[PDB]
Structure 1
Amino acid sequence: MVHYRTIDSPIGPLTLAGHGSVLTNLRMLEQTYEPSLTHWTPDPGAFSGAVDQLNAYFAGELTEFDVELDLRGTDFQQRVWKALLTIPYGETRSYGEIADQIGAPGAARAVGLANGHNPIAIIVPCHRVIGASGKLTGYGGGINRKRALLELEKSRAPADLTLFD
């Protein structure tokens, strides 16, 4: 089937799901409607690699993820989530820039709606994309989760303090 595990984090109870050792889902589900949750087996020891990476990520030790994903969505969504995965830690892009990257100049608004449907939060970094106005998006408190995540990434102390020696 598809099995799931829930872990805690600074921005809330993250839920990881997928078949075997492959993520298909990662969303802070607390206090929203997730239909497909009833069709899922609980397994408190799955995706063991991932949680480490996450807990490391939240601690600031991790900059890049090594996890296997299976994004399912329309072709357009596929391409937008492809581009998303090419924005590095500590950086951002505008919705327009993404629209150019995927080869459909002018589709700022479509990316934004395709960002909303991102199956895997944090690892596919939907938070590293912002409009020109700087106003962030998201219902459910999702704005604060994005903001928090952006702050955490910017507050990254320079890695080696030996470059100052």
Structure 2
Amino acid sequence: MVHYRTIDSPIGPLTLAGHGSVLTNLRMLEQTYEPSRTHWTPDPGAFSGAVDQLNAYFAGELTEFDVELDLRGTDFQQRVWKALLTIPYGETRSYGEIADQIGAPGAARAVGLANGHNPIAIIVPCHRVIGASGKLTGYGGGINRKRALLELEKSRAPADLTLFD
């Protein structure tokens, strides 16, 4: 059983969906074919916390999420998504680095494919992974969404101006 809520965002309407307070999905679903969504119940007040944190994220005021997640995918996808969760705000990794981390040296391209299937964007940070040649990927506007998120995280001001005096 699954309910959903859509919010505005600088990168487009973000659909949050899941069961109870647990997220199963977070995607900019517009202009794409998503047949699951027809089986979902709208609930304009679900995921109160996640929406606040997302809003705070986009406003620069949040860096670490505290949200309940239920990730579904293959063993290999789960390993990749788990490793994605270890990438700090404002940092990046290469696909090769991620393949090394999950114990599959040489599997950069597989990580790229699994990264593409990430059901929960932003919070599981598939945008923080980039290949050696530096080119963003993703159809349907994906490239521009990723870039937006990367530019936001890079623009982060120092955490405490008092440290300068």
Same topology, TM > 0.5: yes
| TM-score range for the pair, normalised by the shorter chain length | over 0.9
Question: 1:14-56: CA deviations, max 9, x gaps?
Answer: 0000000000000000100001011000000000001000000
Correspondence for 2:27? 27
Q: Distance in 2 between matches of 1:158 and 1:40?
A: 41
Question: 1:96-124: CA deviations, max 9, x gaps?
Answer: 00000000100000000000100000000
TM-score normalised according to structure 1 size: 0.99
Q: Distance in 2 between matches of 1:140 and 1:34?
A: 13
TM-superposed CA distance for 1:141, in Å, is 0.5
Q: Distance in 2 between matches of 1:157 and 1:64?
A: 15
Correspondence for 1:146? 146
Q: Distance in 2 between matches of 1:68 and 1:123?
A: 10
Identity among equivalent positions (%) equals 99
TM-superposed CA distance for 1:159, in Å, is 1.3
Q: Distance in 2 between matches of 1:158 and 1:133?
A: 29
Correspondence for 1:91? 91
Segments of structure 2 that go 5 or more residues without pairing to the other structure are: none
RMSD: 0.4
Question: 1:128-148: CA deviations, max 9, x gaps?
Answer: 000000000000010000000
Q: Secondary structure at the match of 2:77?
A: helix
Number of residues of Structure 1 aligned to a counterpart in Structure 2: 165
Show structure 1 runs of 4+ deviating over 3 A: none
